[PDB]
């Protein structure tokens, strides 16, 4: 894995265990997607929502699945890759969570499903860029992806079709270029 999959899961372990520390609202503060006017410029706040987690099983499943799958978009395609995939999905998702149901989400839920797209689609329309899904490991997110939709681990799901849609189009357009 590469220095942007790496300082992502450090980023979300610190402020995981902030949160854990310090309770998850005063963390909220300094992260959240604005959520007063004020702090509409503090531009950071339209990703850094992504770095805050609810549960000990809400990180540690995105986190196996970023380390997976953003480490191999960063290995295969390289860092600036995968900082636009993140950037986009994270204020995309964002910004359809918060139409839905106000300023107060956080996770790199959306994300995943971006790069789940986009490691599928890439992975088979485009096998020479050596970039895929294996068929293993196409069982777990489906199981991850039902179950989230169901929220077993709540009401985030048109901001993850969001993501999973950044995904999709970026892998179409990337293997026709490619
Ligand atoms: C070195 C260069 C660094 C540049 C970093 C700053 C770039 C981002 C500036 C802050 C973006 C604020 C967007 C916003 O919060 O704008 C919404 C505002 C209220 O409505 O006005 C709007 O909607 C306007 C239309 C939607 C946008
Ligand atoms: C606060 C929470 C923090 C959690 C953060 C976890 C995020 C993912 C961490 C993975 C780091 C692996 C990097 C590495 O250093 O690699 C390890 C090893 C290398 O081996 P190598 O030297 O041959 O290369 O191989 C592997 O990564 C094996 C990878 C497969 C791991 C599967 C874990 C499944 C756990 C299921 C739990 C379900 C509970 C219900
Ligand atoms: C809560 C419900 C949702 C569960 C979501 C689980 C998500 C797990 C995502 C893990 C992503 C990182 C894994 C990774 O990046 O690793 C890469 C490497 C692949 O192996 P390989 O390419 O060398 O070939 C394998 C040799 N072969 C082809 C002959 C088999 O190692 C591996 O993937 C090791 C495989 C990891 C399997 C972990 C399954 C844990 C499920 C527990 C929960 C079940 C619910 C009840
Ligand atoms: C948006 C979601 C990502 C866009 C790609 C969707 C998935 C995909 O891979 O779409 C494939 C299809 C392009 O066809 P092709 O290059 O597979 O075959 C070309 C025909 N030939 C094989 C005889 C040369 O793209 C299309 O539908 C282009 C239109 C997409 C509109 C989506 C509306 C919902």
Same mark, same amino acid.
């Given at each position: 894995?590469?220095?942007?999959?790496?300082?992502?899961?450090?980023?979300?372990?610190? &402020?995981?265990?902030?949160? +854990?520390?310090?309770?998850?609202?005063?963390?909220?503060?300094?992260?959240?997607?604005?959520?007063?006017?004020?702090?509409?410029?503090?531009?950071?706040?339209?990703?850094?929502?992504?770095?805050?987690?609810?549960?000990?099983?809400?990180?540690?499943?995105?986190?196996?699945?970023? $380390?997976? *799958?953003?480490?191999?978009?960063?290995?295969?395609? @390289?860092?600036?890759?995968?900082?636009?995939?993140?950037?986009?999905?994270?204020?995309?998702? =964002?910004?359809? +969570?918060?139409?839905?149901?106000?300023? $107060?989400?956080?996770?790199?839920? =959306?994300?995943?499903?971006?790069?789940? @797209?986009? &490691?599928? *689609?890439?992975?088979?329309?485009?096998? +020479?860029? @050596?970039?895929? *899904? +294996?068929?293993?490991?196409?069982?777990?997110? *489906?199981?991850?992806?039902?179950?989230?939709?169901?929220?077993?681990?709540?009401?985030?799901?048109?901001?993850?079709?969001?993501?999973?849609?950044?995904?999709?189009?970026?892998?179409?357009?990337?293997?026709?270029?490619?």
């Amino acid at each position: 894995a590469g220095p942007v999959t790496w300082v992502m899961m450090i980023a979300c372990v610190v &402020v995981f265990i902030a949160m +854990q520390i310090l309770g998850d609202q005063e963390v909220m503060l300094w992260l959240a997607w604005p959520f007063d006017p004020t702090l509409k410029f503090e531009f950071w706040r339209y990703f850094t929502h992504a770095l805050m987690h609810f549960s000990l099983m809400h990180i540690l499943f995105n986190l196996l699945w970023w $380390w997976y *799958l953003g480490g191999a978009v960063e290995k295969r395609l @390289g860092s600036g890759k995968l900082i636009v995939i993140t950037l986009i999905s994270a204020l995309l998702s =964002g910004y359809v +969570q918060q139409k839905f149901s106000g300023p $107060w989400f956080g996770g790199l839920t =959306g994300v995943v499903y971006a790069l789940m @797209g986009y &490691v599928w *689609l890439r992975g088979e329309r485009d096998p +020479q860029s @050596g970039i895929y *899904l +294996q068929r293993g490991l196409i069982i777990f997110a *489906l199981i991850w992806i039902v179950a989230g939709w169901f929220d077993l681990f709540s009401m985030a799901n048109g901001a993850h079709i969001a993501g999973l849609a950044v995904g999709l189009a970026m892998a179409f357009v990337d293997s026709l270029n490619a």
